[PDB]
């Protein structure tokens, strides 16, 4: 049976980077001519596994971890990266194995009015665990004065938004991203 890489890569709806999703791929035989033998991806960096020999490499599960970031925010999506997305939104382990495929989506994710639908977490006390997910809307404490979960002095709203406009150069257009996480019945 073919694998649903099509259902995640060509997903009509993409989740935001603060509220990404994981899908388990247990029982399937893949055809990696859909990933490697194509040119829709602008970022390509496979870690620990090569871009061709991965076909005859069995792994106990594969995860398709999909989201949207900004143009230069793709460089934060790498084990160890200290970037804003890497440290407060979604962190890769330093011993990560897998592939990352990212592509520009300005024509579907950037509107002239400003796209405020895609968001990210600018405020996250401490740092996330490898593959940890946080969707909490609990009001960010900016200082030690009590905020009773309210907005005012020393009291800030935790969540912010992107504003994807067509006027941005290559640096900061929207990008649809997929991170593949492998875990030691899937082959090519």
């Amino acid at each position, epitope marked *: 049976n073919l694998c649903p890489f099509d259902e995640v890569f060509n997903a009509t709806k993409f989740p935001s980077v603060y509220a990404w999703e994981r899908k388990k791929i247990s029982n399937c035989v893949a055809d990696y001519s859909v990933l490697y033998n194509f040119t829709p991806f602008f970022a390509f960096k496979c870690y620990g596994v090569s871009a061709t020999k991965l076909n005859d490499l069995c792994f106990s599960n594969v995860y398709a971890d999909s989201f949207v970031v900004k143009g*230069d925010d793709v460089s934060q999506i790498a084990p160890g990266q*200290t*970037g*804003n997305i890497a*440290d*407060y939104n979604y962190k890769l382990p330093d011993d990560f194995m897998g592939c990352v495929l990212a592509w520009n989506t300005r024509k579907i994710d950037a509107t002239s009015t400003g796209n405020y639908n895609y968001r990210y977490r*600018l*405020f*996250r*006390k*401490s*740092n996330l665990k490898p593959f940890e997910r946080d969707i909490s809307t609990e009001i*960010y*404490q*900016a*200082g*030690n*004065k009590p905020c009773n979960g309210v907005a005012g*002095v*020393n009291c*800030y*709203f935790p969540l*912010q*938004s992107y*504003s994807f*406009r067509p*006027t*941005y*150069g*290559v*640096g*900061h257009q929207p990008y649809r991203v997929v991170v593949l996480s492998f875990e030691l019945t899937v082959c090519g």
Partner: antibody
Amino acid sequence: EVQLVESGGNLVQPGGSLRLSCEVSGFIVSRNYMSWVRQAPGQGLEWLSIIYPGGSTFYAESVKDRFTISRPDSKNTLYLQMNSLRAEDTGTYFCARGLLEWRYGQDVWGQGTTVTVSS
Amino acid sequence: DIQMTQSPSSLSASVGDRVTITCQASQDVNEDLNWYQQKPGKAPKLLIYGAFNLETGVSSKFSGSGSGTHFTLTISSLQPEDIATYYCQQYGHQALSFGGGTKVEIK
């Protein structure tokens, strides 16, 4: 009221050490965006470093590994343990408060503290 | 570190004249340009957030435009109280940086 307190600037030799202090009023350090930007007397602004609400740090390669912006959670203070000082490091030091959304405007800095580096 | 170059480096404008400053980024940084005013013997004070919005506690005479790689502030009427320098700043990348700034005096 929002207010900032710079202090700890004093005369020093090249290669020395110095320390800044700010018992933070108007906000508290423990969970804010805070930068460090110095200005030389009669020159442009110079970005040095920035600590994030979770403790993330960024440095330019010209000032990398020399400056250590850090903070204990036990006190309401941004610390800067400064090492390997040079004559070009003469401030007029300012710590910045980052606001929310695309408004990352560092609106409130303070008055600055006088660090002079000379033989 | 992103290089932000401004022009011109200094200019003289009469009482009530119009001062307009330009600031260019070497890479695209959207509306990510915090614009400050530094009066002589005073810290820089924020004027613009988002490249086109007036900062809170600033006079309505300051209203800018430009986004991406080029940024503009038109002081619709420079005043005797506005005798000061201005500094653009980008924050679009992991290393932040400031523009050279334009020293503005009264003529």
